[PDB]
């Protein structure tokens, strides 16, 4: 599992193969919405949404789904449990550390503005702790002020810059 956001309860589970078509609809709808919102960042044009490899994301346990009790999909999160080729290039000699890389947060507009993303990332933190992984990592386009502010507010440490991105990591305590 349970997470709470905005005083509301959600259930978290890893995606299964039968979730594919719904995730695929969610990524299509999120891409359309980003375009229409006029908030077009070159980083979204670079990264896209992982429609082409969704089956392997599901197989590897890299998709987390956040649902209401009635079964509405409130959010989905894409991670990488090992660095992608981009993560490895971006992070340079830090790429050899074990870390999870958060690639995409998707939140339903019905559930936007309750900081559901904070709890989605917290779930990744908990997973990394369970698995003895020392860091959660992500990158952010240098020009998105509000998103950069958000990551800092959520406790990520600024760790450098490359290719027009700022790099952030959160150390995960085994204490």
CSV table of N, CA and C in Angstrom, one decimal, unseen atoms left out:
chain,number,residue,atom,x,y,z
A,1,UNK,CA,2.0,-3.2,-0.9
A,1,UNK,C,1.0,-2.0,-1.1
A,2,UNK,N,0.9,-1.2,0.0
A,2,UNK,CA,0.0,0.0,0.0
A,2,UNK,C,0.9,1.2,0.0
A,3,UNK,N,0.5,2.3,-0.7
A,3,UNK,CA,1.1,3.6,-0.5
A,3,UNK,C,-0.1,4.6,-0.2
A,4,UNK,N,0.2,5.7,0.4
A,4,UNK,CA,-0.8,6.8,0.7
A,4,UNK,C,-0.3,8.0,0.1
A,5,UNK,N,-1.1,8.8,-0.6
A,5,UNK,CA,-0.7,10.0,-1.2
A,5,UNK,C,-2.0,10.9,-1.1
A,6,UNK,N,-1.8,12.2,-0.7
A,6,UNK,CA,-2.8,13.2,-0.6
A,6,UNK,C,-3.9,12.7,0.3
A,7,UNK,N,-3.6,11.9,1.3
A,7,UNK,CA,-4.6,11.2,2.1
A,7,UNK,C,-5.4,10.2,1.5
A,8,UNK,N,-5.0,9.7,0.3
A,8,UNK,CA,-5.8,8.6,-0.4
A,8,UNK,C,-4.9,7.3,-0.5
A,9,UNK,N,-5.5,6.2,-0.6
A,9,UNK,CA,-4.8,4.9,-0.5
A,9,UNK,C,-4.7,4.3,-2.0
A,10,UNK,N,-3.5,3.7,-2.3
A,10,UNK,CA,-3.2,3.0,-3.6
A,10,UNK,C,-2.5,1.7,-3.3
A,11,UNK,N,-2.7,0.8,-4.2
A,11,UNK,CA,-2.0,-0.5,-4.1
A,11,UNK,C,-1.0,-0.5,-5.2
A,12,UNK,N,0.2,-1.1,-4.8
A,12,UNK,CA,1.3,-1.2,-5.7
A,12,UNK,C,1.6,-2.6,-6.1
A,13,UNK,N,1.9,-2.9,-7.4
A,13,UNK,CA,2.3,-4.3,-7.8
A,13,UNK,C,3.2,-4.1,-9.0
A,14,UNK,N,4.0,-5.1,-9.3
A,14,UNK,CA,4.8,-5.1,-10.5
A,14,UNK,C,3.8,-5.6,-11.6
A,15,UNK,N,4.0,-5.0,-12.8
A,15,UNK,CA,3.2,-5.4,-14.0
A,15,UNK,C,3.4,-6.8,-14.4
A,16,UNK,N,2.3,-7.4,-14.9
A,16,UNK,CA,2.3,-8.7,-15.5
A,16,UNK,C,2.0,-8.7,-17.0
A,17,UNK,N,2.3,-9.8,-17.7
A,17,UNK,CA,2.0,-9.7,-19.1
A,17,UNK,C,0.6,-9.2,-19.5
A,18,UNK,N,-0.4,-9.6,-18.8
A,18,UNK,CA,-1.8,-9.1,-19.1
A,18,UNK,C,-2.0,-7.6,-19.0
A,19,UNK,N,-1.0,-6.9,-18.4
A,19,UNK,CA,-1.1,-5.4,-18.2
A,19,UNK,C,-0.6,-4.7,-19.4
A,20,UNK,N,0.0,-5.4,-20.4
A,20,UNK,CA,0.7,-4.8,-21.5
A,20,UNK,C,-0.1,-3.8,-22.3
A,21,UNK,N,-1.3,-4.2,-22.6
A,21,UNK,CA,-2.1,-3.3,-23.5
A,21,UNK,C,-2.5,-2.0,-22.8
A,22,UNK,N,-2.8,-2.1,-21.5
A,22,UNK,CA,-3.1,-1.0,-20.7
A,22,UNK,C,-1.9,0.0,-20.5
A,23,UNK,N,-0.7,-0.5,-20.3
A,23,UNK,CA,0.5,0.3,-20.2
A,23,UNK,C,0.7,1.0,-21.6
A,24,UNK,N,0.6,0.2,-22.7
A,24,UNK,CA,0.8,0.7,-24.0
A,24,UNK,C,-0.2,1.9,-24.3
A,25,UNK,N,-1.4,1.9,-23.7
A,25,UNK,CA,-2.4,2.9,-23.9
A,25,UNK,C,-2.1,4.1,-23.1
A,26,UNK,N,-1.6,3.8,-21.9
A,26,UNK,CA,-1.1,4.8,-21.0
A,26,UNK,C,0.1,5.7,-21.6
A,27,UNK,N,1.1,5.0,-22.2
A,27,UNK,CA,2.2,5.6,-22.8
A,27,UNK,C,1.8,6.5,-24.0
A,28,UNK,N,0.9,5.9,-24.8
A,28,UNK,CA,0.4,6.7,-26.0
A,28,UNK,C,-0.3,7.9,-25.5
A,29,UNK,N,-1.1,7.8,-24.5
A,29,UNK,CA,-1.9,8.9,-24.0
A,29,UNK,C,-1.0,10.0,-23.3
A,30,UNK,N,0.0,9.5,-22.6
A,30,UNK,CA,0.9,10.4,-22.0
A,30,UNK,C,1.8,11.2,-23.0
A,31,UNK,N,2.2,10.5,-24.1
A,31,UNK,CA,2.9,11.2,-25.2
A,31,UNK,C,2.1,12.3,-25.9
A,32,UNK,N,0.8,11.9,-26.2
A,32,UNK,CA,-0.1,12.8,-26.8
A,32,UNK,C,-0.3,14.0,-25.9
A,33,UNK,N,-0.4,13.8,-24.6
A,33,UNK,CA,-0.7,14.8,-23.7
A,33,UNK,C,0.5,15.8,-23.6
A,34,UNK,N,1.7,15.2,-23.5
A,34,UNK,CA,2.9,16.1,-23.5
A,34,UNK,C,3.0,17.0,-24.7
A,35,UNK,N,2.7,16.5,-25.9
A,35,UNK,CA,2.7,17.3,-27.1
A,35,UNK,C,1.7,18.4,-27.0
A,36,UNK,N,0.5,18.0,-26.6
A,36,UNK,CA,-0.7,19.0,-26.6
A,36,UNK,C,-0.5,20.0,-25.6
A,37,UNK,N,0.2,19.7,-24.5
A,37,UNK,CA,0.4,20.6,-23.4
A,37,UNK,C,1.3,21.7,-23.8
A,38,UNK,N,2.1,21.5,-24.9
A,38,UNK,CA,3.0,22.6,-25.4
A,38,UNK,C,4.3,22.6,-24.7
A,39,UNK,N,4.4,21.6,-23.8
A,39,UNK,CA,5.6,21.6,-22.9
A,39,UNK,C,6.4,20.5,-23.5
A,40,UNK,N,7.1,20.8,-24.6
A,40,UNK,CA,7.9,19.9,-25.4
A,40,UNK,C,9.3,20.1,-25.2
A,41,UNK,N,9.9,19.1,-24.5
A,41,UNK,CA,11.3,19.2,-24.1
A,41,UNK,C,12.1,18.2,-25.0
A,42,UNK,N,13.3,18.7,-25.4
A,42,UNK,CA,14.1,17.8,-26.3
A,42,UNK,C,14.4,16.5,-25.7
A,43,UNK,N,14.5,16.4,-24.3
A,43,UNK,CA,14.7,15.2,-23.6
A,43,UNK,C,13.6,14.2,-23.8
A,44,UNK,N,12.3,14.6,-24.0
A,44,UNK,CA,11.2,13.7,-24.2
A,44,UNK,C,11.3,13.1,-25.6
A,45,UNK,N,11.7,14.0,-26.6
A,45,UNK,CA,12.0,13.6,-28.0
A,45,UNK,C,13.1,12.6,-28.0
A,46,UNK,N,14.1,12.7,-27.1
A,46,UNK,CA,15.2,11.7,-27.1
A,46,UNK,C,14.7,10.4,-26.4
A,47,UNK,N,14.2,10.5,-25.2
A,47,UNK,CA,13.9,9.3,-24.5
A,47,UNK,C,12.7,8.5,-24.9
A,48,UNK,N,11.6,9.2,-25.3
A,48,UNK,CA,10.4,8.6,-25.6
A,48,UNK,C,9.8,7.8,-24.5
A,49,UNK,N,8.9,6.9,-24.8
A,49,UNK,CA,8.3,6.0,-23.9
A,49,UNK,C,8.5,4.6,-24.4
A,50,UNK,N,8.8,3.6,-23.5
A,50,UNK,CA,9.3,2.3,-24.0
A,50,UNK,C,8.2,1.3,-24.5
A,51,UNK,N,7.6,1.7,-25.5
A,51,UNK,CA,6.6,0.8,-26.2
A,51,UNK,C,7.3,-0.4,-26.9
A,52,UNK,N,8.5,-0.2,-27.4
A,52,UNK,CA,9.2,-1.2,-28.2
A,52,UNK,C,9.7,-2.4,-27.4
A,53,UNK,N,10.0,-2.2,-26.1
A,53,UNK,CA,10.5,-3.2,-25.3
A,53,UNK,C,9.7,-3.5,-24.0
A,54,UNK,N,8.4,-3.1,-24.1
A,54,UNK,CA,7.6,-3.3,-22.9
A,54,UNK,C,7.6,-4.7,-22.4
A,55,UNK,N,7.6,-5.7,-23.2
A,55,UNK,CA,7.5,-7.1,-22.7
A,55,UNK,C,8.7,-7.4,-21.9
A,56,UNK,N,9.9,-6.9,-22.3
A,56,UNK,CA,11.1,-7.2,-21.5
A,56,UNK,C,11.1,-6.4,-20.2
A,57,UNK,N,10.6,-5.2,-20.3
A,57,UNK,CA,10.4,-4.4,-19.0
A,57,UNK,C,9.6,-5.2,-18.0
A,58,UNK,N,8.5,-5.7,-18.5
A,58,UNK,CA,7.6,-6.6,-17.6
A,58,UNK,C,8.3,-7.8,-17.1
A,59,UNK,N,9.0,-8.5,-18.0
A,59,UNK,CA,9.7,-9.7,-17.6
A,59,UNK,C,10.7,-9.5,-16.5
A,60,UNK,N,11.4,-8.3,-16.6
A,60,UNK,CA,12.5,-8.0,-15.7
A,60,UNK,C,12.0,-7.3,-14.4
A,61,UNK,N,10.7,-7.2,-14.3
A,61,UNK,CA,10.2,-6.5,-13.1
A,61,UNK,C,10.5,-5.1,-13.0
A,62,UNK,N,10.5,-4.4,-14.1
A,62,UNK,CA,10.9,-3.0,-14.2
A,62,UNK,C,9.8,-2.0,-14.3
A,63,UNK,N,8.5,-2.5,-14.3
A,63,UNK,CA,7.3,-1.7,-14.4
A,63,UNK,C,6.5,-1.9,-13.1
A,64,UNK,N,6.3,-0.8,-12.4
A,64,UNK,CA,5.5,-0.8,-11.1
A,64,UNK,C,4.2,-0.1,-11.4
A,65,UNK,N,3.1,-0.6,-11.0
A,65,UNK,CA,1.8,-0.1,-11.2
A,65,UNK,C,1.2,0.3,-9.9
A,66,UNK,N,0.4,1.4,-9.9
A,66,UNK,CA,-0.1,2.1,-8.7
A,66,UNK,C,-1.6,2.2,-9.0
A,67,UNK,N,-2.4,1.5,-8.3
A,67,UNK,CA,-3.9,1.3,-8.6
A,67,UNK,C,-4.7,1.7,-7.4
A,68,UNK,N,-5.9,2.2,-7.6
A,68,UNK,CA,-6.9,2.3,-6.5
A,68,UNK,C,-7.5,1.0,-6.2
A,69,UNK,N,-8.2,0.9,-5.0
A,69,UNK,CA,-8.8,-0.3,-4.6
A,69,UNK,C,-9.9,-0.8,-5.6
A,70,UNK,N,-10.5,0.1,-6.3
A,70,UNK,CA,-11.5,-0.2,-7.3
A,70,UNK,C,-10.8,-0.7,-8.6
A,71,UNK,N,-9.5,-0.5,-8.7
A,71,UNK,CA,-8.7,-1.0,-9.9
A,71,UNK,C,-8.4,0.0,-10.9
A,72,UNK,N,-8.6,1.3,-10.7
A,72,UNK,CA,-8.1,2.4,-11.6
A,72,UNK,C,-6.6,2.5,-11.6
A,73,UNK,N,-6.0,2.6,-12.8
A,73,UNK,CA,-4.5,2.8,-12.8
A,73,UNK,C,-4.2,4.3,-12.6
A,74,UNK,N,-3.7,4.6,-11.4
A,74,UNK,CA,-3.3,5.9,-11.0
A,74,UNK,C,-1.9,6.4,-11.5
A,75,UNK,N,-1.0,5.4,-11.6
A,75,UNK,CA,0.3,5.7,-12.1
A,75,UNK,C,1.1,4.5,-12.5
A,76,UNK,N,2.2,4.7,-13.2
A,76,UNK,CA,3.1,3.6,-13.6
A,76,UNK,C,4.5,4.2,-13.6
A,77,UNK,N,5.4,3.4,-13.2
A,77,UNK,CA,6.8,3.8,-13.2
A,77,UNK,C,7.7,2.7,-13.9
A,78,UNK,N,8.6,3.3,-14.7
A,78,UNK,CA,9.6,2.5,-15.5
A,78,UNK,C,10.9,2.7,-14.8
A,79,UNK,N,11.4,1.6,-14.4
A,79,UNK,CA,12.8,1.7,-14.0
A,79,UNK,C,13.7,0.8,-14.8
A,80,UNK,N,15.0,1.0,-14.5
A,80,UNK,CA,16.0,0.1,-15.0
A,80,UNK,C,16.7,-0.5,-13.8
A,81,UNK,N,16.8,-1.8,-13.6
A,81,UNK,CA,17.5,-2.3,-12.5
A,81,UNK,C,19.0,-2.5,-12.7
A,82,UNK,N,19.4,-2.3,-13.9
A,82,UNK,CA,20.8,-2.1,-14.3
A,82,UNK,C,20.9,-1.0,-15.3
A,83,UNK,N,22.0,-0.3,-15.4
A,83,UNK,CA,22.0,0.9,-16.3
A,83,UNK,C,21.7,0.5,-17.8
A,84,UNK,N,20.9,1.3,-18.4
A,84,UNK,CA,20.8,1.2,-19.9
A,84,UNK,C,22.1,1.7,-20.5
A,85,UNK,N,22.2,1.7,-21.8
A,85,UNK,CA,23.4,2.2,-22.5
A,85,UNK,C,23.6,3.7,-22.3
A,86,UNK,N,22.5,4.4,-22.2
A,86,UNK,CA,22.4,5.8,-22.0
A,86,UNK,C,22.9,6.1,-20.5
A,87,UNK,N,22.3,5.4,-19.6
A,87,UNK,CA,22.7,5.6,-18.1
A,87,UNK,C,24.2,5.4,-18.0
A,88,UNK,N,24.7,4.4,-18.7
A,88,UNK,CA,26.1,4.1,-18.5
A,88,UNK,C,27.0,5.2,-19.1
A,89,UNK,N,26.6,5.7,-20.3
A,89,UNK,CA,27.3,6.8,-20.9
A,89,UNK,C,27.3,8.1,-20.0
A,90,UNK,N,26.1,8.4,-19.5
A,90,UNK,CA,25.8,9.6,-18.8
A,90,UNK,C,26.6,9.7,-17.4
A,91,UNK,N,26.6,8.5,-16.7
A,91,UNK,CA,27.1,8.4,-15.3
A,91,UNK,C,28.6,8.1,-15.3
A,92,UNK,N,29.2,7.8,-16.4
A,92,UNK,CA,30.7,7.7,-16.6
A,92,UNK,C,31.2,6.7,-15.5
A,93,UNK,N,32.2,7.1,-14.7
A,93,UNK,CA,32.8,6.1,-13.8
A,93,UNK,C,31.9,5.7,-12.6
A,94,UNK,N,30.8,6.4,-12.4
A,94,UNK,CA,29.8,6.0,-11.5
A,94,UNK,C,29.0,4.9,-12.0
A,95,UNK,N,29.0,4.6,-13.3
A,95,UNK,CA,28.1,3.6,-13.9
A,95,UNK,C,28.4,2.1,-13.4
A,96,UNK,N,29.6,2.0,-12.8
A,96,UNK,CA,30.0,0.6,-12.3
A,96,UNK,C,29.3,0.3,-10.9
A,97,UNK,N,28.8,1.3,-10.2
A,97,UNK,CA,28.1,1.1,-9.0
A,97,UNK,C,26.8,0.5,-9.3
A,98,UNK,N,26.3,-0.4,-8.4
A,98,UNK,CA,25.0,-0.9,-8.6
A,98,UNK,C,24.0,0.2,-8.2
A,99,UNK,N,23.0,0.3,-9.1
A,99,UNK,CA,22.0,1.4,-8.9
A,99,UNK,C,20.8,1.0,-9.8
A,100,UNK,N,19.6,1.5,-9.4
A,100,UNK,CA,18.4,1.5,-10.2
A,100,UNK,C,18.3,2.9,-10.8
A,101,UNK,N,17.8,3.0,-12.0
A,101,UNK,CA,17.7,4.2,-12.8
A,101,UNK,C,16.2,4.4,-13.1
A,102,UNK,N,15.6,5.5,-12.6
A,102,UNK,CA,14.2,5.7,-12.8
A,102,UNK,C,14.0,6.5,-14.2
A,103,UNK,N,13.5,5.8,-15.2
A,103,UNK,CA,13.3,6.3,-16.5
A,103,UNK,C,12.0,7.1,-16.7
A,104,UNK,N,10.9,6.6,-16.3
A,104,UNK,CA,9.6,7.3,-16.5
A,104,UNK,C,8.7,7.1,-15.3
A,105,UNK,N,8.2,8.3,-14.9
A,105,UNK,CA,7.0,8.4,-14.0
A,105,UNK,C,5.8,8.8,-14.9
A,106,UNK,N,4.7,8.1,-14.8
A,106,UNK,CA,3.5,8.5,-15.4
A,106,UNK,C,2.4,8.5,-14.4
A,107,UNK,N,1.8,9.7,-14.2
A,107,UNK,CA,0.6,9.8,-13.3
A,107,UNK,C,-0.6,10.2,-14.1
A,108,UNK,N,-1.7,9.5,-13.8
A,108,UNK,CA,-3.0,9.9,-14.3
A,108,UNK,C,-3.5,11.3,-13.8
A,109,UNK,N,-4.0,12.1,-14.8
A,109,UNK,CA,-4.4,13.5,-14.4
A,109,UNK,C,-5.5,13.4,-13.4
A,110,UNK,N,-6.3,12.3,-13.3
A,110,UNK,CA,-7.2,12.2,-12.2
A,110,UNK,C,-6.5,12.2,-10.9
A,111,UNK,N,-5.3,11.8,-10.9
A,111,UNK,CA,-4.5,11.7,-9.6
A,111,UNK,C,-3.3,12.6,-9.6
A,112,UNK,N,-3.3,13.6,-10.4
A,112,UNK,CA,-2.1,14.5,-10.5
A,112,UNK,C,-2.3,15.5,-9.3
A,113,UNK,N,-1.1,16.1,-8.9
A,113,UNK,CA,-1.2,17.1,-7.8
A,113,UNK,C,-1.3,16.6,-6.3
A,114,UNK,N,-1.1,15.4,-6.1
A,114,UNK,CA,-1.2,14.8,-4.8
A,114,UNK,C,0.3,14.3,-4.4
A,115,UNK,N,1.2,14.6,-5.3
A,115,UNK,CA,2.6,14.1,-5.1
A,115,UNK,C,2.7,12.6,-5.1
A,116,UNK,N,1.8,12.0,-5.9
A,116,UNK,CA,1.9,10.5,-6.1
A,116,UNK,C,3.3,10.1,-6.5
A,117,UNK,N,4.0,10.9,-7.3
A,117,UNK,CA,5.3,10.6,-7.8
A,117,UNK,C,6.3,10.4,-6.6
A,118,UNK,N,6.1,11.1,-5.6
A,118,UNK,CA,7.0,11.0,-4.4
A,118,UNK,C,6.9,9.6,-3.8
A,119,UNK,N,5.7,9.1,-3.7
A,119,UNK,CA,5.4,7.8,-3.2
A,119,UNK,C,5.8,6.7,-4.2
A,120,UNK,N,5.7,6.9,-5.5
A,120,UNK,CA,6.2,6.0,-6.5
A,120,UNK,C,7.7,5.8,-6.4
A,121,UNK,N,8.4,6.9,-6.3
A,121,UNK,CA,9.9,6.9,-6.1
A,121,UNK,C,10.2,6.2,-4.8
A,122,UNK,N,9.5,6.5,-3.7
A,122,UNK,CA,9.7,5.9,-2.4
A,122,UNK,C,9.6,4.3,-2.5
A,123,UNK,N,8.7,3.8,-3.3
A,123,UNK,CA,8.6,2.4,-3.5
A,123,UNK,C,9.9,1.8,-4.2
A,124,UNK,N,10.4,2.6,-5.1
A,124,UNK,CA,11.7,2.2,-5.8
A,124,UNK,C,12.8,2.1,-4.7
A,125,UNK,N,12.8,3.1,-3.9
A,125,UNK,CA,13.8,3.2,-2.8
A,125,UNK,C,13.7,2.0,-1.9
A,126,UNK,N,12.5,1.6,-1.5
A,126,UNK,CA,12.2,0.4,-0.7
A,126,UNK,C,12.7,-0.9,-1.4
A,127,UNK,N,12.4,-1.0,-2.7
A,127,UNK,CA,12.8,-2.1,-3.5
A,127,UNK,C,14.4,-2.2,-3.5
A,128,UNK,N,15.1,-1.1,-3.7
A,128,UNK,CA,16.5,-1.1,-3.8
A,128,UNK,C,17.1,-1.5,-2.4
A,129,UNK,N,16.5,-1.0,-1.3
A,129,UNK,CA,16.9,-1.4,0.0
A,129,UNK,C,16.8,-2.9,0.2
A,130,UNK,N,15.6,-3.5,-0.2
A,130,UNK,CA,15.4,-4.9,-0.1
A,130,UNK,C,16.4,-5.7,-0.8
A,131,UNK,N,16.8,-5.2,-2.0
A,131,UNK,CA,17.8,-5.8,-2.9
A,131,UNK,C,19.2,-5.4,-2.6
A,132,UNK,N,19.5,-4.7,-1.6
A,132,UNK,CA,20.8,-4.2,-1.3
A,132,UNK,C,21.5,-3.4,-2.4
A,133,UNK,N,20.8,-2.5,-3.0
A,133,UNK,CA,21.3,-1.7,-4.1
A,133,UNK,C,21.5,-0.3,-3.4
A,134,UNK,N,22.7,0.3,-3.6
A,134,UNK,CA,23.0,1.5,-2.8
A,134,UNK,C,22.5,2.8,-3.3
A,135,UNK,N,22.0,2.9,-4.5
A,135,UNK,CA,21.6,4.2,-5.1
A,135,UNK,C,20.3,4.0,-6.0
A,136,UNK,N,19.5,5.0,-5.9
A,136,UNK,CA,18.5,5.2,-7.0
A,136,UNK,C,19.0,6.5,-7.7
A,137,UNK,N,18.9,6.5,-9.1
A,137,UNK,CA,19.5,7.5,-9.9
A,137,UNK,C,18.5,7.9,-11.0
A,138,UNK,N,18.6,9.2,-11.3
A,138,UNK,CA,17.9,9.7,-12.5
A,138,UNK,C,18.5,10.9,-13.1
A,139,UNK,N,18.1,11.2,-14.3
A,139,UNK,CA,18.6,12.4,-15.0
A,139,UNK,C,17.4,13.4,-15.3
A,140,UNK,N,17.7,14.7,-15.5
A,140,UNK,CA,16.6,15.7,-15.7
A,140,UNK,C,17.2,16.7,-16.7
A,141,UNK,N,16.4,17.0,-17.7
A,141,UNK,CA,16.8,18.1,-18.5
A,141,UNK,C,17.2,19.4,-17.7
A,142,UNK,N,18.3,20.0,-18.0
A,142,UNK,CA,18.7,21.2,-17.2
A,142,UNK,C,17.8,22.4,-17.2
A,143,UNK,N,16.9,22.5,-18.2
A,143,UNK,CA,15.9,23.6,-18.3
A,143,UNK,C,14.6,23.4,-17.7
A,144,UNK,N,14.2,22.3,-17.2
A,144,UNK,CA,12.9,22.1,-16.5
A,144,UNK,C,13.0,22.4,-15.0
A,145,UNK,N,12.8,23.7,-14.7
A,145,UNK,CA,13.0,24.2,-13.4
A,145,UNK,C,12.1,23.4,-12.4
A,146,UNK,N,10.8,23.2,-12.7
A,146,UNK,CA,9.9,22.6,-11.7
A,146,UNK,C,10.2,21.2,-11.4
A,147,UNK,N,10.7,20.4,-12.5
A,147,UNK,CA,11.0,19.0,-12.3
A,147,UNK,C,12.3,18.9,-11.5
A,148,UNK,N,13.3,19.7,-11.8
A,148,UNK,CA,14.6,19.7,-11.0
A,148,UNK,C,14.3,20.1,-9.6
A,149,UNK,N,13.4,21.1,-9.3
A,149,UNK,CA,13.0,21.4,-7.9
A,149,UNK,C,12.4,20.2,-7.2
A,150,UNK,N,11.6,19.5,-8.0
A,150,UNK,CA,10.9,18.3,-7.4
A,150,UNK,C,11.8,17.3,-7.0
A,151,UNK,N,12.8,16.9,-7.8
A,151,UNK,CA,13.7,15.9,-7.4
A,151,UNK,C,14.5,16.3,-6.1
A,152,UNK,N,14.9,17.6,-6.1
A,152,UNK,CA,15.7,18.0,-4.9
A,152,UNK,C,14.7,17.9,-3.6
A,153,UNK,N,13.5,18.4,-3.8
A,153,UNK,CA,12.5,18.3,-2.7
A,153,UNK,C,12.3,16.9,-2.2
A,154,UNK,N,12.3,16.0,-3.2
A,154,UNK,CA,12.2,14.5,-2.8
A,154,UNK,C,13.5,13.9,-2.3
A,155,UNK,N,14.5,14.7,-2.0
A,155,UNK,CA,15.7,14.2,-1.4
A,155,UNK,C,16.9,13.7,-2.2
A,156,UNK,N,16.8,13.9,-3.5
A,156,UNK,CA,17.9,13.5,-4.4
A,156,UNK,C,19.0,14.5,-4.3
A,157,UNK,N,20.2,14.0,-4.4
A,157,UNK,CA,21.4,14.8,-4.4
A,157,UNK,C,21.9,15.1,-5.9
A,158,UNK,N,22.1,16.3,-6.2
A,158,UNK,CA,22.7,16.7,-7.4
A,158,UNK,C,24.1,16.2,-7.5
A,159,UNK,N,24.4,15.5,-8.6
A,159,UNK,CA,25.6,14.8,-8.8
A,159,UNK,C,26.4,15.1,-10.1
A,160,UNK,N,26.0,16.1,-10.8
A,160,UNK,CA,26.8,16.6,-12.0
A,160,UNK,C,25.9,16.8,-13.2
A,161,UNK,N,26.5,17.0,-14.3
A,161,UNK,CA,25.8,17.4,-15.5
A,161,UNK,C,26.5,16.8,-16.7
A,162,UNK,N,25.7,16.4,-17.7
A,162,UNK,CA,26.3,15.9,-19.0
A,162,UNK,C,25.2,15.9,-20.0
A,163,UNK,N,25.6,16.3,-21.2
A,163,UNK,CA,24.7,16.3,-22.4
A,163,UNK,C,23.4,17.0,-22.3
A,164,UNK,N,23.5,18.1,-21.5
A,164,UNK,CA,22.3,18.9,-21.2
A,164,UNK,C,21.4,18.4,-20.1
A,165,UNK,N,21.8,17.4,-19.4
A,165,UNK,CA,21.1,16.8,-18.3
A,165,UNK,C,21.8,17.1,-16.9
A,166,UNK,N,21.0,17.3,-15.9
A,166,UNK,CA,21.5,17.2,-14.5
A,166,UNK,C,21.3,15.8,-14.0
A,167,UNK,N,22.3,15.3,-13.2
A,167,UNK,CA,22.3,13.9,-12.7
A,167,UNK,C,22.0,14.0,-11.2
A,168,UNK,N,21.1,13.1,-10.7
A,168,UNK,CA,20.7,13.1,-9.3
A,168,UNK,C,20.8,11.7,-8.8
A,169,UNK,N,21.1,11.5,-7.5
A,169,UNK,CA,21.1,10.2,-6.9
A,169,UNK,C,20.7,10.3,-5.4
A,170,UNK,N,20.1,9.3,-5.0
A,170,UNK,CA,19.7,9.2,-3.6
A,170,UNK,C,20.4,7.9,-3.0
A,171,UNK,N,21.1,8.0,-2.0
A,171,UNK,CA,21.8,6.9,-1.4
A,171,UNK,C,20.7,6.2,-0.5
A,172,UNK,N,20.7,4.9,-0.6
A,172,UNK,CA,19.7,4.1,0.1
A,172,UNK,C,20.3,3.4,1.3
A,173,UNK,N,19.8,3.8,2.5
A,173,UNK,CA,20.4,3.2,3.7
A,173,UNK,C,20.0,1.8,4.0
A,174,UNK,N,21.0,1.0,4.4
A,174,UNK,CA,20.8,-0.3,5.0
A,174,UNK,C,20.7,-0.3,6.5
A,175,UNK,N,20.8,0.8,7.1
A,175,UNK,CA,20.8,0.9,8.6
A,175,UNK,C,19.5,0.2,9.1
